[PDB]
């Protein structure tokens, strides 16, 4: 599995687009890299809905082709918030098929192996500093097939380095949709 | 208790106000949400002084009406930092009541009940995931009456779950002010 980051905006673009709330550009790719005034993070489409983490987005709207999209889903207790996917988005399809071999994709585009160690638990093979996963909250955890198993919430770190990851599992996103 | 968020600047103003050091805006509320170039957290006014956490502010000045304000305090070992409260700045009054029934008001205006497990901790009755708390350190911890009993320092996590939190006691801020 591989990935390549692509920038589509800069300061003026975010500042104006965030004011008007209307983004004329077009969505493309499975995981978009979003940003607010204070923080930047990721958002991943799974089942035609832009899912992201509550801590980063809060209850803000997404800038869209016809104006600001209101959050369709909001599961605060699981730090989840999802917007109805805008046009051009190549949505991922769920998975969670017993596999314990996952791949975390970060916001600079690096696909790192995470061995599932639970439902929302997953140890890393290659430890990295907590500094290496900043801005990747809301990223997707991909099994080998290329199907989404969950949304990354934050690194499980021990005084210095990151050891494991905590994720909102795809299944939970499915139940929140109902 | 209840509370609500209110954005007062976007990226372009944080930027400009970060370099000129002068904040030409009316301060209101009691807990403000502040930012630096690589971070955003909270800061609250107890006893006429804007307290925040050291791991956020560090030793930087706070942009103010006549120019940047210099730190009045700096307990690096306690992770506490403070600035004299600029014009107005509503200030929460110290505790009194010793109620184990604490209240953590998160950076997104979310209020979550906390049970004081002692001098400097407070368990969460409803154990949220650790990431929910991101960007909320520095926030206040009240008791049913609306009194400040601490400053959110860090969530005491376990397997990515924020079972409880760590706060600087208001008594320790007071000791400092002595």
């Amino acid at each position: 599995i591989t990935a390549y980051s692509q920038q589509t905006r800069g300061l003026l673009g975010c500042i104006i687009t965030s004011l008007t709330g209307r983004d004329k550009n077009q969505v493309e790719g499975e995981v978009q890299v979003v940003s607010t005034a204070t923080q930047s993070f990721l958002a991943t489409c799974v089942n035609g809905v832009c899912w992201t983490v509550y801590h980063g987005a809060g209850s803000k709207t997404l800038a869209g082709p016809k104006g600001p999209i209101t959050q369709m889903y909001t599961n605060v207790d699981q730090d989840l918030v999802g917007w109805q996917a805008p046009p051009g988005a190549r949505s991922l399809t769920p998975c969670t098929c017993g596999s314990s071999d996952l791949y975390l994709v970060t916001r600079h585009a690096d696909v790192i192996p995470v061995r599932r160690r639970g439902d929302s638990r997953g140890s890393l093979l290659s430890p990295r500093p907590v500094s290496y996963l900043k801005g990747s909250s809301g990223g997707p955890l991909l099994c080998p097939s290329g199907h989404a198993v969950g949304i990354f919430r934050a690194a499980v770190c021990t005084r210095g380095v990151a050891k494991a990851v905590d994720f909102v599992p795809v299944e939970s996103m499915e139940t929140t949709m109902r | 208790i209840t509370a609500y968020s209110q954005q007062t600047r976007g990226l372009l103003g944080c930027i400009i106000t970060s370099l000129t050091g002068r904040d030409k805006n009316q301060v209101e509320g009691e807990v403000q949400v502040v930012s630096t170039a690589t971070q955003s957290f909270l800061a609250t006014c107890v006893n006429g002084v804007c307290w925040t956490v050291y791991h956020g502010a560090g030793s930087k000045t706070l942009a103010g009406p006549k120019g940047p304000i210099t730190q009045m305090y700096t307990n690096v070992d306690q992770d506490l930092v403070g600035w004299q409260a600029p014009p107005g700045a509503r200030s929460l009054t110290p505790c009194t009541c010793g109620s184990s029934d604490l209240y953590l008001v998160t950076r997104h205006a979310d209020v979550i009940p906390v049970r004081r497990r002692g001098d400097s901790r407070g368990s969460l009755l409803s154990p949220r995931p650790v990431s929910y708390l991101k960007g909320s350190s520095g926030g206040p911890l009240l008791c049913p009456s609306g009194h400040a009993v601490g400053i959110f320092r860090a969530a005491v996590c376990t397997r990515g779950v924020a079972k409880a939190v760590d706060f600087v006691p208001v008594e320790s801020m007071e000791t400092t002010m002595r």
Binding site: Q6, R9, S18, V27, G29, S35, A37, L62, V105 | -
Partner: peptide, 13 residues
């Protein structure tokens, strides 16, 4: 209020 804003994308392959 200010809106979140897609700033780029990560294209899987």
């Amino acid at each position: 209020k200010g809106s979140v804003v897609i700033v780029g994308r990560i294209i899987l392959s």
